[PDB]
Ligand binder design. Sequence first.
Ligand SMILES: CC(=O)Oc1c(C)cccc1C(=O)O
Ligand SMILES: [Ca+2]
Ligand SMILES: [Ca+2]
Ligand SMILES: [Ca+2]
Ligand SMILES: [Ca+2]
Ligand SMILES: [Zn+2]
Length: 316
Amino acid sequence: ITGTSTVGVGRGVLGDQKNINTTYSTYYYLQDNTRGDGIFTYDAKYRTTLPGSLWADADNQFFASYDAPAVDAHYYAGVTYDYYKNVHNRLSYDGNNAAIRSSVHYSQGYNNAFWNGSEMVYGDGDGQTFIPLSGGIDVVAHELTHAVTDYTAGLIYQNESGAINEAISDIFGTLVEFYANKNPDWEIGEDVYTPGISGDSLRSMSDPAKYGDPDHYSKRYTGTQDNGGVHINSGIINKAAYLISQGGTHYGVSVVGIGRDKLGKIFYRALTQYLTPTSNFSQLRAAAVQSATDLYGSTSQEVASVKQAFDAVGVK
Ligand SMILES: CC(=O)Oc1c(C)cccc1C(=O)O
Ligand SMILES: [Ca+2]
Ligand SMILES: [Ca+2]
Ligand SMILES: [Ca+2]
Ligand SMILES: [Ca+2]
Ligand SMILES: [Zn+2]
């Protein structure tokens, strides 16, 4: 919409107060003009037609329960924008400040979030398995990273390239969570998953097997469920990324950690310069090694650690 940039205030899913960038034109819209070509948040109104209506509010105050998923979708999309621009010099998901669009209140009791090829989409959860999914900054950043992947490597969403696609989203969603630095961890979705159970999550990068996901290539799933296990075999790569960053000994193989920022530089470079739509795990290994070589030198600890990490999860 055409209008003037304003600043609204509201509360997110977890009941936390935050400021949000809005636009005024009769109503206050969830349209942030301060980042790129705009961040826009929409109301899907419990149906599945998308994007729905640009979110409109009469007084620029967003404290109703119905407002909370919108507040967080909008805010955490801005945080994610900031991360890619400030940390990787990437302007929005296409590198050219594409408008970022999100719809919330998608469907009824919908326990998922996704990128549909053009925008982010968030269910409200059924209140049992999930609360509104935009309350999780790692979930929001996971979803926006799917757009980044689609504009760069283009990893096909099936089998090993699809598991890499998923891990890339878990990795950067986690790196965005640490960037924001509010209760950061190597778990995925803990802020919005199972409101009646404490201490669990959708997935764990530090120990994927905690929820039945493989942490070694020898334990890879090869059936046809979940697009050939894209949310399952992602644990093999998530574990590798965790180890690159934090170090550890896994099935007897020791990895010297090099920290989250270097993890992020290496995987961002792999994603944007070396991976292709059909890359498999072995090719991801070579891409990360080449990326680390580009960044830190053939003889660096960093190259050595990437190798140890892929060794540890049985990927040669
Ligand atoms: C964070 C995440 O994995 O979100 C999803 C959920 C909650 C359900 C189904 C698919 C996805 C996805 O983004 O792959
Ligand atoms: Ca209001
Ligand atoms: Ca957390
Ligand atoms: Ca997390
Ligand atoms: Ca829980
Ligand atoms: Zn995903």
